[PDB]
Design a protein around this ligand. Sequence first.
Ligand SMILES: CCCCCCCCC[C@H]1C[C@@H]1C(=O)O
Ligand SMILES: [Fe+3]
Ligand SMILES: [Fe+3]
Length: 221
Amino acid sequence: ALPDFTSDRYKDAYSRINAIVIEGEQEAHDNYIAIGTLLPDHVEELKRLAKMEMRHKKGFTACGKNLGVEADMDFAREFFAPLRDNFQTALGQGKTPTCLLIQALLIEAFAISAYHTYIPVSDPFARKITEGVVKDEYTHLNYGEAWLKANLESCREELLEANRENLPLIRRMLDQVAGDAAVLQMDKEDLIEDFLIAYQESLTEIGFNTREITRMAAAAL
Ligand SMILES: CCCCCCCCC[C@H]1C[C@@H]1C(=O)O
Ligand SMILES: [Fe+3]
Ligand SMILES: [Fe+3]
């Protein structure tokens, strides 16, 4: 069941998946620095999170180089454009809960699911890099959960709107990546399950009840 990492079929799918991961890590760095303009007293902690994202980007860049694959960066920029646009719109409006739901919850849960699914089918070099990134994703999810949990009473409606608008974009991103992910021997059903479990667990931690969460996860449709 392990893929042939040297085949043209594998390298072609990897060129797009690796580019999406590299672009995602760069946008994650940018997003935590941007949140620092909304939360000036959190700047040092956000800089630390942004620095971890740069370490992840460098590591995944090395994964692509190791397989002799040239990352399709243009494809990756277009892939993130819808979610990036919604983050920039919220940032410009000073909407911190929306920025945090997009980056610290949706994007981190998407990263956790993708990385957990990739690890058992990854090449030995990439496996170590991916394993060394997963602990940091939980740190980032925890940061977002902690702020939203402390501020839930003033941003309940905003979070429901942010979820309604952005959860379907994650669903569309999963649909667009499924073909290439299957070449990498990753099952779309495992990616969906792991993402929903991480996202539902974060919403539970924040303080949403079962009914609220069910209504929220249903927005994906
Ligand atoms: C098969 C799915 C692979 C594509 C999904 C990878 C998304 C990368 C998400 C990174 C930006 C998130 C982070 O570092 O917090
Ligand atoms: Fe990361
Ligand atoms: Fe992250």
